[PDB]
Structure formats: structure tokens, C-alpha cells
A paper describes a structure:
We also uncovered a complex HURP-microtubule binding behavior, likely involving both structured and unstructured elements in HURP and tubulin. These interactions may influence binding cooperativity, as indicated by differences we observed in cooperative binding of HURP constructs to microtubules, and by how HURP compacts the lattice geometry.
The dynamics of kinetochore-attached microtubules are regulated by hepatoma-upregulated protein (HURP) and the mitotic kinesin-8 Kif18A, but the underlying mechanism remains elusive.
Author numbering:
A (entry chain C), B (entry chain A): 1 to 37, 47 to 437
C (entry chain B), D (entry chain D): 1 to 426
Write the structure that this text describes.
Amino acid sequence: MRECISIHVGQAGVQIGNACWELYCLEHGIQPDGQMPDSFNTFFSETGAGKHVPRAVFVDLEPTVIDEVRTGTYRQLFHPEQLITGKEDAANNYARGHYTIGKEIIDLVLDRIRKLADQCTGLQGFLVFHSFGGGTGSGFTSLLMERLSVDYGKKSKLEFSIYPAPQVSTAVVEPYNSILTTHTTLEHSDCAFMVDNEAIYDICRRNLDIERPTYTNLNRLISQIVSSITASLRFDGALNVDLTEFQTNLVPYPRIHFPLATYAPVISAEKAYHEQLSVAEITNACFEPANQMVKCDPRHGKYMACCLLYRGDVVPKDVNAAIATIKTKRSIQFVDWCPTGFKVGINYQPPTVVPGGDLAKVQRAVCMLSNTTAIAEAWARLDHKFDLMYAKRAFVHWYVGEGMEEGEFSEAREDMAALEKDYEEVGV
Amino acid sequence: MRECISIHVGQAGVQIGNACWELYCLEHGIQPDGQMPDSFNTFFSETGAGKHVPRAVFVDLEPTVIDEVRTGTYRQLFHPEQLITGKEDAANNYARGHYTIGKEIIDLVLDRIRKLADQCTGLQGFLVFHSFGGGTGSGFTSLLMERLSVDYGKKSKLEFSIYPAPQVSTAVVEPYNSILTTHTTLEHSDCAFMVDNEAIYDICRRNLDIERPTYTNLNRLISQIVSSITASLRFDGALNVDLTEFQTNLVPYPRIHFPLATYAPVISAEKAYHEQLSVAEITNACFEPANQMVKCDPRHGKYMACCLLYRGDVVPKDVNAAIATIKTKRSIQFVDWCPTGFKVGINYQPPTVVPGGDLAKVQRAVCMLSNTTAIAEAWARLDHKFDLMYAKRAFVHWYVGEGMEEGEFSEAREDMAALEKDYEEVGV
Amino acid sequence: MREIVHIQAGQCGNQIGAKFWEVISDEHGIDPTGSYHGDSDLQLERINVYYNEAAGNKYVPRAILVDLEPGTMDSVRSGPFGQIFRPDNFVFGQSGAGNNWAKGHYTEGAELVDSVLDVVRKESESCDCLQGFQLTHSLGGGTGSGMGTLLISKIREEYPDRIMNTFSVVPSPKVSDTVVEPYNATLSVHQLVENTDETYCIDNEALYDICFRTLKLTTPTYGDLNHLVSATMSGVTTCLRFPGQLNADLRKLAVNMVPFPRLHFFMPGFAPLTSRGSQQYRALTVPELTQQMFDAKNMMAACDPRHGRYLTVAAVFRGRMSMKEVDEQMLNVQNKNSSYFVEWIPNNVKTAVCDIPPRGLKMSATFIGNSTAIQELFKRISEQFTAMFRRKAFLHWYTGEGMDEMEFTEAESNMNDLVSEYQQYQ
Amino acid sequence: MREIVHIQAGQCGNQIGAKFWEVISDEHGIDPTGSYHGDSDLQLERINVYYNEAAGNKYVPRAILVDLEPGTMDSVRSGPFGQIFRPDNFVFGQSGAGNNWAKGHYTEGAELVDSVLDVVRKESESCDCLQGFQLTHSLGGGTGSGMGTLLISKIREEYPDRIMNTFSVVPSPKVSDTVVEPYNATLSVHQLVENTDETYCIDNEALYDICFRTLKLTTPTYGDLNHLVSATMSGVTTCLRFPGQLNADLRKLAVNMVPFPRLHFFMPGFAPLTSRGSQQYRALTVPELTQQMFDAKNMMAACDPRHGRYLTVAAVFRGRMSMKEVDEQMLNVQNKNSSYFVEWIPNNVKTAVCDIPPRGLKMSATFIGNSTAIQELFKRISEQFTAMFRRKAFLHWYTGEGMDEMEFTEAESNMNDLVSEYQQYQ
Ligand SMILES: Nc1nc2c(ncn2[C@@H]2O[C@H](COP(=O)(O)OP(=O)(O)OP(=O)(O)O)[C@@H](O)[C@H]2O)c(=O)[nH]1
Ligand SMILES: Nc1nc2c(ncn2[C@@H]2O[C@H](COP(=O)(O)OP(=O)(O)OP(=O)(O)O)[C@@H](O)[C@H]2O)c(=O)[nH]1
Ligand SMILES: Nc1nc2c(ncn2[C@@H]2O[C@H](COP(=O)(O)OP(=O)(O)O)[C@@H](O)[C@H]2O)c(=O)[nH]1
Ligand SMILES: Nc1nc2c(ncn2[C@@H]2O[C@H](COP(=O)(O)OP(=O)(O)O)[C@@H](O)[C@H]2O)c(=O)[nH]1
Ligand SMILES: [Mg+2]
Ligand SMILES: [Mg+2]
């Protein structure tokens, strides 16, 4: 009845999409070849006789990562034409993704997205998975978002993006790409959910007792978060919430649309036996700084809006009591202009566990989405990195050679300054 | 030879009429289906062969109460068309009964009354049973009284009305309806026999030792009172009194026509064995304030006219002796302008007892009707309630919406003030 | 006889309507296949009030189910008693309001209101004489709030002489289920003040409180709250369906309870309510019923009547009882607590008794109270609205759908005026 | 999909190219006949990057061998894996450069450059999407230096949008193998600063030092130095040929490592490197690899990184590893040695991880460093050039071929400008 389209861009987006689609196939009992021995309609199409194809688009400017998908276990799951690949990557360059290489491919992906949307009767919106520090995941994501805003318009668009860590970075030119893509995608997004690799590393090390986490573990956790978000669309519960409610509840002002995600309970099978994972305990754990998925201090900011999504054996009265207990706590503070700052959703389906996974099976799960002013600190840090790097004009010629102008750098810096000023003004 | 027509309006009127007709059928030996295995002619017509139909009209603006009759045990007794029902009730609103809903039905009931009167050769008058605080039982009876006075004229009209209690009332807007119906029916009635629910509750609790009286007990007692009144028409006695004699004896001035009724002896079977229920004892009991059917103090007023109707083994000499003994008592005072204040009626038929009833079988019974100035206290209390509500204009819009004007409220208040002034003037 | 049209809007409205229809079908002896299977003919004498006879002794509820998303429609259709509803009465959209009042009232509601009004008009033309309409919805949502408001306005335009009842749940004082609740609540109250004859205010916190302390329920569910609400709805309209000693229909209650047209917000209540264990330790009598009724713990609205005064009170009794006891007890409670009753209205209490009690219970009663303590709830909603509107938070979501700031100002002014009136008559 | 063209110039270039092709053929499971004999299909999935399929499941390298004497060409033809090379790709002259830059760049190289350019053009036209070119040569000779310079200039004229990588052996500080080394080195650097994208500086003294202290090799041989260089070359382009978690091709490395176009001279390194006896006394983990990488003794350029500051650092990891440990340890080494990292570039380190480790080893890593210590080598070469040019020693050999003193002055000035820039950003 109501359908949702998922787009995965770049290496990180494609791999997180692999994890998410594995999780969905496990949830709905669909085998990797598309056969199963009907709320899954929102995420899976039906073609012919007993074949289910995902409503997904996988885009990358280099063929390796998507060639892995076309060769791996889920080769028969995806339709051949929705796995679009280029020949040359963007090489961590925003300008290459935006102008030089992005322009040669975006028409095909737009055609495929239109073809997918033609088969939908109640399309709710889009989810795009990408990175901030990448080349294609920055430039092509910005170009695609602007084209989607021009084409579709009112339909909601939600981002899942990997926020660069404060001290743990892979690239050297990450601040340039992050600032440019934020400036370009500010006006064409409805809300963006933020995660950080360093925070997930710390969570795996502490709660899951894992010495050597890899990217697969992080992708599994991100897939669990996304499944918790979309369970309202893929199942039926006591109190449901679809895509538009997230946008209308978590965004107070059009430019302030960067909430961060949190999941609980994340524990191994060893510690799960000695714990009673009640609603109050997980609700409390969702609000501790050590459990959040973005490395930042919620204590140094004030919450604006909070969204709690419960799964499994949950009854509303304990939810009400837990939220009241949270409200009476002084350690965490809400802005004075938001007397009502909670959105509550309850679902009946408990969270499933992937075989060979790192999480233990549980009766309950909470996905908390919080809009807080503490993101201003991360924005200021990224802006400082950009200023330090741009003072000496380092790596600027790489961007200029691909079609970018230094005026774009200046405009992006000005827009970021305006954004942090807006955050500071809202805080008071 | 001489016939009487009974009209029952509203829920209370219809239910009291049910009790009364049950009592009449019991007294005259008529089965509930109208067959009997000839003074009853005054109350039961003869149609075809061995079928006796009552001379009654049952009216209500809602169907449920009369539907209970049409599906009850006395279904075969009444002529089906004489049971007239509306479609929507008056909702405790005098204006709805008088203007909005009354005009749609009164023509049919007038036609039926005319048809009933055409079968009478010596029609004595009308007995109408209704309430004061009700919606239809106020408005429709006022309109019906106007139409009857216009049409028939000189034929006497007697009301049996339920007065609102000083402290025990059901509706919130009862004073409005009571004042309006009094103002409307002052000039069209000949006399009104008046009862109170609270007084009957007290009498049932004290004399009859009934812990939890219901409406059935009250209706049975009222039916006994009416049967005592009409025994003179339905039987032959030593000294009989007809309908016109009540009017010419109990009404000294045209506006002062509100006597109140009293019945004696009312006792259970337990106490009847240890008592000699002589004429003097019941005559004395009729005058005590604890035994009257209206919650009021006769000791604070002066009697103007009194009517005593004896039933059963009663001889005139003891009646005269008891009346003399009453006259010598100083605690009960008569107005100085009425040297002769007693009307006497004696009947031979003892009061019958309904099986399963609460009254015991007795040899003698007295129904005492008294016109006393003590009703001015109740009138003043009702006027005070009306003034208190009308000061804030509460509930006025409900009446105005249905076709009433505030000038009607002012006129009713003025007329009630004039009436209480008349009572206080005749008191001196 | 007298006919009532039922409308359900939004998720909460649809759920409460489903529970209410299950309870009603239980009362009248109808299985979820539409056939009659009761014993007493009283269940069938007045069945036309809620059900339609559709040939082959089958009965279809006279209800219209309305929503902007197909989810709740599918959930209700697939659940128990989902077969009785007529397939043509399911009117649903594809987009959904997304907890936005402007979407429900101006964008999507404007699209779906013509179809829902067509269905309502057909149903109302079918019946010979309709008493009025009743609607179940919420004030915190976007579909229920705006759509029920628009439907109420359109119906009152079409049928001005009929009765308009609403059973709307209101935002709670302690915990909110939506960030933008005050906006929707304020606008909905602004419209309901003009376009409704009587509104019953239900609070989720009060229902949780009742289920916890009184019913001793360890893990209450939304089904239990819907059960209590449905019990109240059934208790309100008992006199239209069963015979009794003192009958009071919807218009009688309306005339008795609302003295001034803007003061028509009530707090419902039900009795008896006992746990499983404590059932043995009391005897079913009228005194315990009136004790349970006149108690802040039993109130279904999150307002304590002892901070205000009662304007009018309705006590609707079911079962075989003595009228003398009822009248004496109402007089006693009015005399004992004279400080809590308005002084310029004598006899604040209106009484009605129906012979047929609910199945399973020997005796029952439903309490309707029109107190001035509702000003506290209205004041809290107004103050939250003002705090939010001072900084224009979340305002662009409503402004992008055609709403103007003047609408918000007018709604705030209406709320303030209503609170001022309630304080004035106190 | 991405294609690389290989060129070998001079004796040293030809020898290292032969060793590199041996190592690559070992990696991809190809015997010296050209047929495929591996097991994993991953060896064949991206085989087109280096090899051409020439019917009958036989593969020929996409390499061009260039020299001005038939000696080294005959030696590489008659040696192991000499048969896999295409016979038409051997372009050789008869005279020879005589360790003279002018002969290589103006007299003989001008004659042979047309044929070598024809071969390169044919090979580049054959491939559908070429990533770029890599050249192996030496800066101390006359054939390698001048001819690689001329070929680089001509290719950059023809293909300005592709990547040009060079693995050039630079003169060592302690002992020189040629009397006229500074002239050729200075001119070659003057051309390389302009016509290349990234240069990897190799020092024979550093390779001898590594083979002595680290590998415990009693009698090192040029084959072993070529083995180490080939290991570095194969480690650079692993992400183009095998799947991994974080992929980084040549353009990614270029974007991450060179901030200003003239600062593209790196010092490569490899790990792990241990002797036969000492293999048992250590565990292969990421801390050990990054300890070996960040160490002056493991660098293949005869420069001390502690005498300057790192601009950028690239680490390419091969094998099954945890990204958490890699990122943690790179952050830790950046924090511990903050004094050796440029302050105005945060996060100097770029990391890439490939799944397939080299045959025989479970874990391996290649280190590329862009440090300011290369100014020491450039300063030494420029100083020797100035000392020789002051007395006009051996100048007539270069002048008789048609070169002018102005070219020498321009090259010396360019070297001074380069060292001045490196000191400025230091
Ligand atoms: N959580 C998570 N993050 C990833 C993963 N893969 C890459 N990333 C992040 O992506 C950032 C760099 O962007 P990439 O995705 O690698 O590159 P890209 O977006 O494809 O853009 P190109 O450079 O053109 O290839 C790194 O800093 C990583 O933190 C992954 O599998 N899981
Ligand atoms: N004694 C007695 N009084 C009754 C009975 N039924 C109703 N009443 C009185 O009638 C008063 C209200 O008027 P109703 O008779 O109930 O209503 P109505 O006259 O039908 O007028 P509507 O409101 O339009 O239906 C109550 O205050 C009762 O005291 C009854 O059976 N016996
Ligand atoms: N009593 C009750 N309340 C509900 C139920 N479902 C939702 N609610 C209330 O309705 C509010 C949410 O509004 P909702 O109906 O979901 O928005 P809508 O879809 O636009 O109508 C919340 O504050 C809940 O407390 C239910 O089944 N029972
Ligand atoms: N690593 C390595 N270096 C070499 C090899 N052969 C020669 N060289 C170096 O190259 C320099 C000689 O230059 P050469 O290439 O022979 O001159 P060309 O004939 O003009 O190219 C000497 O300084 C050697 O150090 C070799 O096989 N391996
Ligand atoms: Mg990539
Ligand atoms: Mg009635």
C-alpha cells in the first residue's frame, strides 16, 4: 500500500545496504535467491511467481564493491539494472563526484529511480545511505539530492550518513568534502541521521566485549538501527510512526535537521543472562553519553526533540513511567521553548538476530533519535579543520582542476558559519 | 349513563394510568384481555359481544413507554389507535412540548378525544394525568388544556399532577417548566389534585415499612387515591359526590384551585392485626402532617375547604362525630370566612387489594382532599428557584431556540407573584 | 426508532470504534458474522439504533471508518469483528497526515472529505429519523484532529438541527506522545467549541491511573483503555435502546448539562470497577456506586474536580433498583459537598434509570460531570502553545500547507476566552 | 576496467622490470609460458590491469622494454620469464648513451623515441580505460635518465589527463657509481618536477642497509634489491587488482598525498621484513607492522625522516585485519610523534585495506611518506652539481651533443627553488 525506496551510494552506502538487505531477508523469511516458502510489500516487489526483488538502487563510480555484490551470495536477489557502476572512482574528490564523473551517470540512476517509483502506489519517500568524507558519497549524493528535490518535490528524503570522527579520520581532504556537501545539501534535505565510526568502535569494545571489531560489525549495528526505524512500516504495532512523522517532529527549523541515532540494548550473550532488560533500564541507557552512536557530549548541549521507537514485549504504561522518570532528571535538559519533546512509537515485532552475529537475542529494543545543540561542537571542530587547511590553500588545485572555483569554498565556509550561528542562537 | 374520560400524558401519566386501569379491571372483574365472565359502564365501553374497552387516551412524544403497554399484559385491553406516540421526546423542554413537537400531534389526540366523547351520553368531564417538571408532560398538557377549554367549554377538567419536591428533584430545569405550565394552565383548569414523590417515599418508609420503594408502589398508591375519588361514579353508596361537586366545593376563588390529596389508612399486614381501624381513628390520621401526600406543613397554613370520601363499612353518625371532634381541635384552624368547611361522601364498596401489593386488606378507607393556604410556601420556594436560575440567564437559549421569548418568562414570573399575593391576601 | 450515525477518524478513533462495536455486538447478541444469536427480545426491539437490517437476518453496523493511511484499516479489517463492517464504508487515503493538523484539514482532508461526506449523507438518508452523530478521534494527531474537525464542520453545515457528540482523547499533563501536540490540541479545541453540542474529554494518564490503582492491572494495554472508553460510550446511550423507569436520551442530557453553549466539555466516569481478588469483599448496592462515581480517582479526565465546582451532573443508572434510594443518595451527596456545587443552580444532578443492566453485572452506572476544573487542562494546553509560539518553533511545517499565523492567534484567543468564562462562572 | 602501462628504460630499469614482472606473475598464478595455473578466481577477476589475453588462454604483459644497447634486452630475454614478453615490444638501439644525459635525451633517444612512442600508442589504444603509466629507470645513467625523461615528456604531451608514476633510483650519498652522476640527476629532477604526478625515490645505500641489518643477508645481490623494489611496486597497486574493505587507487593516493604540485617526491617502505632465524621470535600483528613502517631503518630512501616533518602519509594494508586497530594505531602514532607532523594539516595519514595478502604472508603493509627530509638529498645533489660546474668539469662531453650552459643553469635554479619550497613548508 505504502512503499519506500532505498538508495545506497559509495562504498560505505553499498556495504551498509548489503547488511540491511540481509537483515530484511532474514526478517521476512525471504531466501537470498528471492524465493520464500504481507507487510513486506513496502520493501520488496513481486514479479512473476514467487520472486521478490528489493526496491533498491546501488550506485558507485567504481565497479569493485558492486562487483562483489554481483558475485556474492545475494547475486540473484537484486535486479541487474539497479546495480549501476562507473569505470573511474571520484578519488576522494568532491568536484569529481559533482561535475566531472557524476554528470556521466546521474541520468541513468534517475531513470532507474523513476522506473522503481512507477511501480509504487503509496511511495512514502527515499532513504539514501552515503558518507561525508568520500568523493562520490559526497558529490554524487549532493547532485542526486538536488535532482530528486527538483523532480519529486514534496516527498520526504531521509539521509543516513557516516559523520567524520573528531580524532579518527581515514582521509586527508575530508573537511573540504564535508563542508561542500553540507552546504549543497542543506536546502534539499528533510532530515539526516548521523552516526560516527569511532563511537561505534567504542560501543563494540565496551558493551559487546569485542577486541577487534571490523566494518561488518559496524554495518550490522547500522542495519539494526535502520530496521528499528522501518519496523513501523514493515509491521503492525500498538502505536505506529511512518516517515513523515520523523520529519515533522524532529525538525524545529528548516536548517536544523541533523539528529543523531542511538540504539539499546547492545550486549553480548554472556551478560544478557544476568540482566533483566526492562523498559525503564533501556530507556535510561539510551540517554547516557557512553551509549550514543556519535562521539559528542549531550551534557554540553540541550535536547530539542526526542523520538523513541520500542520493539517487542512493550506496554505503554512502562513507557510513560520511564519518560516521566527521564523528565524529572536534572542532569539532562531540554530547551525551554519545547515543553513537549518526546515522540513515542511501539511495535510488536521483537528484534531478530543474524546467525553468527555479535548481538544477543532480546525481548525489547529502543532506537532513540535526538536533535540536540551539541552537534554545534562537531560543526565548529570541522570548520576549524577547514580553516586551518584552507589558510595554506592545500589540495585546492585538485578541486579547481575538476571544475570547482574558490568562490565555492568561500560560500561553503560562510554557510557553515551561518549554520553554527543559527545553532548557537537557538540554544539560548 | 354518566361517563368520564381519562387522559394520560408523558411517562409518569402513562405509568400511573397503567396502575389505575389495572386497579379498575381488578375492581370490576374484567380480565386483562377485556372479557368478563353494570356501573362499570362509566369507565368501560361495550363493543361487539363481551369486550370492554377503556375510555382512555395515552399520549407521549416518545414511543418506548407506550410500546411497553402495547407489548405488555394489557395489550389486548386498549384500542390500538387510542395509544398515540410521537417520534422524538420533548427532552425536559417546555418549549419543545408546546410549540415545536406539540403541534405535530395534538390534532390527532383531539380527534380521538372527540371520537370518545361522541360515544358518551352523559359525559361528566376529563381526568388528565401529567407531571410538572417534564417536557411533554408540561407543554403538551398546557396546549391540550387550552384546546379542550376552547372546544368543550363548560365540562369540568380535573388534573392529577406530580409536584416537584422541595429537596428531591430529578431534572435541573424543573422550575422553568413548572412556572410556565402553571401560568399557562391557570385559566383553563377547574381544580388540580396534587401529590409529591418525596412525601410518598416517606409514607412508604414509615407506615408501610418498605425499605426500598420504587415507582410501582407510588403508582399503586396514586391509583388507590383515584379509585377512592371515583368510587362514587363507579358504585352506589349512602351519600354520593360527582365530579362537579368537587369543583363547586373545593374552589372558593377561580385562581385558588390547588387542593392536595391524602389517603388513610395505609398500613401493612403486620400492623393491621393489632389495630381497630375505626372511622374516628382514620379521620384523625387524615389530618396529621406525617400522613399527607405533599411534603408541606398544614400547621403553618389555614384550611379553606375539606372533602372526605369514606368507603366500606361506614355509617353517617360516626362520620359526624369524628368531624365534630376535628372541629373542636385547636391545632388545626379554618379560615374565618368559611364557617362550613367539610364535604362528606360515603360509599359501600370497600377498597380492593391488588395481589402482591403492599397495602393490607381493610374494611374502611378515607380519601381527604384539602384546599389550604400552606401551598403558598411551596409556590414561594419554586419562585425563588426560578429567580435564582433566571438571574444568570442559564438554560434560556434552549427554550428560546424552540420558539419561546423571554417576555414569556417575565409574564410567568409576574403571574406567579400575583398568585402568591392572592394566597397571602386570602390567608388574612 | 431513533438512529445514531458513528464515525471513526484516525488510528485511535479506529481502535476505540472497533472496541466499541465489539462491546455493542456483545450487548445485542450478534456474532462477528452479522447474525442474531441472543435470547432476550429486548436486544432486538431497538436494534435499529446502531445496526441496519440487510436481508437474510444479517445486521451491518451504521458506522463510517475514515483514515488517511491504509494501515489501521487493514488492521481493523483483519481483526475480530472486522467482517461486520460494510466494505463500502472504508474510506482511506494513501498519503497520511503525519501528525500535521494542516495536512488533515487543508491538504489531504480537503481531498477525502467529499467522499466521506457522500458516505455519511447516504447513511443519514437511509434512516427514517436520526438523533445525531457521534465521533471518536484524538486531538494530538494530524489525521484524527484536523479530519474530525473538518467532518464536524461539514456535517453541522449539512445537519444543523441534530446532535453532535464527540469522544476525543486530549493531551496528557505529564507525558506527551507528540512534540507538536499543543498546536493540534489548540486548533481542535477552537473548532470544537463552535461546532459541537457536547464533548467528552478522555485522558490516557487517567485511564492508566484507573487501571493501576482500581483495576489492579499489572500490565495495562491500549485494549483495556479502549474497553473502558467503550463501556462509557455504551452507558451514555442506554436509554435509546432499552426500556427503563426514567428515560433520558441525548437531547435530554444536552438540555440538562450545558447551561451556556460554549460550556459543553464533560469528564466521564464509570462504576463499578473492581479487581479480581477484591470482588468478594463488597456488596453491590447504590451507595457504593455513588461513592465510586463521585471520586477523583475514578475520573477519566486528568483533572481533579475538587479544585473547582460542579455546574451540572448526570447519573445514568442501569439495572433493577429503587428510585427512592437513588434520589435520597443524590440529595445526600449534594448536601454533604455543597461547597463543590455551584450555588445559583439548585439540583445540579440529573437522574435516569434503565432496567437492563450490562451483561455480567447486576448493576452499573455512568457518571457525566460538567466541572470548572477543565480550565486547568485548557490553561496548560494554552500555556504550552504560547511557549511554543513565542519562538515560532515547528511553525513552518504548518505554514507551508497554507496556514496563516492569524489562525494560530485566533485559536489562542478562543482558548483564553473559554478559560476566562470558566473562571468567571466559578 | 582500469589499465596500467609499464615501461622499462636502461639497465637498472630493465632489471627491476624483470623482477617486478616475475613477482606479478607469481601473484596471479601465471607460469613463464603465459598460461594460467592458479586456484583462486580472484587472481583472474582483475588480471586485465597488467596482462593482455592473446587467445588460447595465454597472457602477455602490457610492458614496453627500451634500451640503447642490445645487451640487457638479450639478458632479460634469455633469463627466467623472458618468454612471456611480446617480441614486438623490445625496442633497442645499437650505439648506447655512454652514461651521458645529452646522448640519451638529444642524439640517440631522439631517434628511438618515435618507435617507442608508436609502441606505447598502440598499447594505450588497445586498452579501453587506462589509469596511467608507470616507468622504471635510474637517474645516474645516460640511457635511463635522458630516455625516461624524453618519454615522460612525450607521453604527458599525448596523455595529459592520466597518472604518471616513476620508480627511479636516485644517487646515494656515500658512494657514487658514476663520475658524472650529479649532472644527470639534476637535469632529470628538473624534468621530473614538471612532467610527473608522483615520484618514488629509491636509494641503493638504503637497500644495502636494510638487507644487512634487517634481513641479516651476508651477501646481498642486485636481485634482492630488485625484489624489495618489486614488492613495493606490487604493494602500491593492490587495490586495483583485488577486493578490499577500503579501496585506494593511484588517483586517490595522488589526491591524498601531494598538496602542492611540485611536492610529489615520496620515500617508500615495506613491512614485515625479518630474517630466517628471527621469524619465530615475533607475532604478526598490526602494531608490529606499523612499528616497522614508522622507522628510519626501514625506509628505502637514504634520508632520516626525523630531520624534518611529514606532510602526508599513506599506509596500504593487505590481509584480513580489523579496521579498529588500524585506525587506533595510526591515531596513536600521530599523537606520540606530533612534533614530526605538519601542524596545518590535521590527520596526515591516509589508510587503505585490501583483503588478499601476498603469497606466503598472512599480513603485510606498504608505507608511502611525503616528508621534507628529501630536501637533504636534493641539497646534496645541487651542491655537488655547483661544485662541478664551477670548474666546468666534464662539460664538453655534454656540450658536444648540442646542449647549452643555460640548461644547466635552469636545472640548478629549479633544484634551488624546490629545496627552498621544501624548507619553507618545513
Ligand atoms: N561504517 C562504515 N563506514 C565506512 C565503510 N566503508 C567506508 N566507510 C567510511 O567512508 C569514508 C570514506 O568514504 P568512502 O565510502 O570510503 O569513499 P566513497 O564514498 O565511495 O567515495 P570515493 O572516494 O569516490 O570512492 C571513510 O572515512 C569510512 O569511515 C563501511 O563499510 N562501514
Ligand atoms: N410518581 C411518579 N412520578 C414519576 C414517574 N415517572 C416520572 N415521574 C416524575 O416525572 C418527572 C419528570 O417528568 P417525566 O414524566 O419523567 O417526563 P415527561 O413528562 O414524559 O416529559 P419528557 O421529558 O418530554 O419526556 C420526574 O421528576 C418524576 O418525579 C412515575 O412512574 N411515578
Ligand atoms: N486510548 C487510546 N489512545 C490512543 C490509541 N492510539 C493512539 N492514541 C493516542 O493518540 C495520540 C496519537 O494520535 P494519532 O491518532 O496516532 O494521530 P492520527 O493518526 O493523526 O490520528 C497519542 O497521544 C495516543 O495517546 C489507542 O488505541 N487508545
Ligand atoms: N637497484 C638496482 N640498481 C641498479 C641496477 N643496475 C644499475 N643500478 C644503478 O644504476 C646506476 C647506473 O645507471 P645505468 O642504469 O646503468 O645507466 P644507463 O645505462 O644509462 O641506464 C648505478 O648507480 C646503479 O646503482 C640494478 O639491477 N638494481
Ligand atoms: Mg569508492
Ligand atoms: Mg419522556
